[PDB]
Amino acid sequence: ETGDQRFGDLVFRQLAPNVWQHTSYLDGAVASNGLIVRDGGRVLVVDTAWTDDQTAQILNWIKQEINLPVALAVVTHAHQDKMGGMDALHAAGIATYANALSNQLAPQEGMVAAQHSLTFAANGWVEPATAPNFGPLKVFYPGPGHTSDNITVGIDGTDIAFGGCLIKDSKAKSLGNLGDADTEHYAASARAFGAAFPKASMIVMSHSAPDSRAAITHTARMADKLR
Ligand SMILES: O[B-](O)(O)c1cc2cc(CBr)ccc2s1
Ligand SMILES: [Ca+2]
Ligand SMILES: [Ca+2]
Ligand SMILES: [Ca+2]
Ligand SMILES: [Zn+2]
Ligand SMILES: [Zn+2]
């Protein structure tokens, strides 16, 4: 697409003045998207790429095009598209945060655990002391859906919310990989994510281009048929 930039195996698309989407491919060639946020004098990353080499490519692109230190990364669940690059984040000295449940499931899912655990209230909001100096990232656990551990992130100051692999696009035909999914609670979880970030108009997700809020309602409608 016009305006996109390629660095090695990675493609970046600016979504807002201080937000970019990172896309990595794993062989057909499957795309996974995460986010890069410029918060003042530092950078925040949401999700790794599929692999350590791909994740290092994100870090080098950030140094070349943004030239600000990467303070921390939040990863959205314990699967390869979201945490495959944890060793690269650790080698680069980036503090890593995941849901505690993602850190618990990580060895069983073949992932490396993050250095810190985020915990959540009954209402899905992160307990603030487990998310120190997160700037505009607002972390919400919507309930089990794509996986039991899936978390979501709002970028405060923007129109952007990230559903990760929980949300799928509004023309989708399936919910994608349901092997570790909670079929009963998925619809409610997708709706809870839309309610958490009621004013977000750009919904970014792992396996499609950014969509409108129609991705949330469409994903919930498809999920209703699993219960
Ligand atoms: O459930 B999801 O985090 O969306 C994953 C999709 C996927 C695909 C391959 C081969 Br292409 C290997 C690992 C994973 S994980
Ligand atoms: Ca590794
Ligand atoms: Ca599994
Ligand atoms: Ca039940
Ligand atoms: Zn997954
Ligand atoms: Zn995924």
- Domain limits of the chain? 1-227
212 alpha carbon, distance to own chain's centre = 17
Q: Indicate the pairing of strand 160-164 with strand 202-205.
A: parallel
- Return the amino acid letter for 178: L
Nearest to 204 by CA among 147, 173, 163: 163
Backbone angles phi, psi at 81, to 5 degrees: -70, -20
Query: Counting atoms of ligand 1 from 1, which one is nearest the CA of 30?
Result: 11
DSSP at 103: H
Query: Counting atoms of ligand 1 from 1, which one is nearest the CA of 77?
Result: 3
Q: Which CATH class is domain 1-227?
A: alpha beta
- Reported as type and span, the H/E element at residue 189 is helix 186-196
Euclidean distance between CA atoms 6 and 108, whole angstroms? 33
Nearest to 97 by CA among 81, 67, 123, 119: 119
Euclidean distance between CA atoms 7 and 162, whole angstroms? 23
Which string of DSSP letters, residue by residue, matches 46-94?
A: ES--SSHHHHHHHHHHHHHHT-S-EEEEEE-SSSHHHHTTHHHHHHTT-
Backbone angles phi, psi at 217, to 5 degrees: -65, -40
Q: Identify the three-state secondary structure at position 34.
A: strand
The set of residues, in sequence order, having a beta carbon less than 8 Å from that of 176 and lying 6+ positions away, is 146, 165, 168, 207
Nearest to 136 by CA among 15, 33, 18: 18
- Ligand closest to 55 (CA) is 2
**From the CB of 158, is ligand 1 less than 6 Å away?**
no
CB 77 within 8 A of CB 150: yes
Q: Identify the three-state secondary structure at position 222.
A: helix
Euclidean distance between CA atoms 208 and 143, whole angstroms? 22
Euclidean distance between CA atoms 56 and 47, whole angstroms? 13
Euclidean distance between CA atoms 31 and 22, whole angstroms? 10
Nearest to 14 by CA among 171, 204, 182, 219: 204
Euclidean distance between CA atoms 19 and 15, whole angstroms? 6
Instruction: Give the residue, by CA position, lying nearest to ligand 1 atom 14.
Output: 80
Give all strands of the β-sheet with 137-140 in edge-to-edge order. Answer: 137-140, 152-155, 160-164, 202-205
Which resolution in angstroms does this entry have?
1.4
Instruction: Give the residue, by CA position, lying nearest to ligand 1 atom 12.
Output: 80
Mark the residues whose beta carbon lies below 5 A from ion ligand 6.
Answer: 81, 165, 206
DSSP at 125: B
Neighbouring C-beta atoms of residue 166, cutoff 10 Å: 29
Euclidean distance between CA atoms 80 and 101, whole angstroms? 16
Q: How were these coordinates obtained? A: X-ray
Structure tokens belonging to residue 178: 């349901």
Euclidean distance between CA atoms 168 and 133, whole angstroms? 30
Euclidean distance between CA atoms 110 and 123, whole angstroms? 29
DSSP at 147: S
Residue 28: burial class (beta carbons within 10 Å; 0-12, 13-18, 19+):
exposed
Give all strands of the β-sheet with 10-16 in edge-to-edge order. Answer: 5-7, 10-16, 19-26, 30-39, 42-46, 70-75, 95-99, 116-118
- Return the amino acid letter for 14: Q
Ramachandran bin of 40, using left for φ above 0, alpha for ψ from -120 to 50, beta for the remaining angles: left
- What Cα–Cα distance (Å) separates residue 64 from each residue in 58, 72, 213? 10, 18, 33
Euclidean distance between CA atoms 93 and 113, whole angstroms? 15
CB 151 within 8 A of CB 191: no
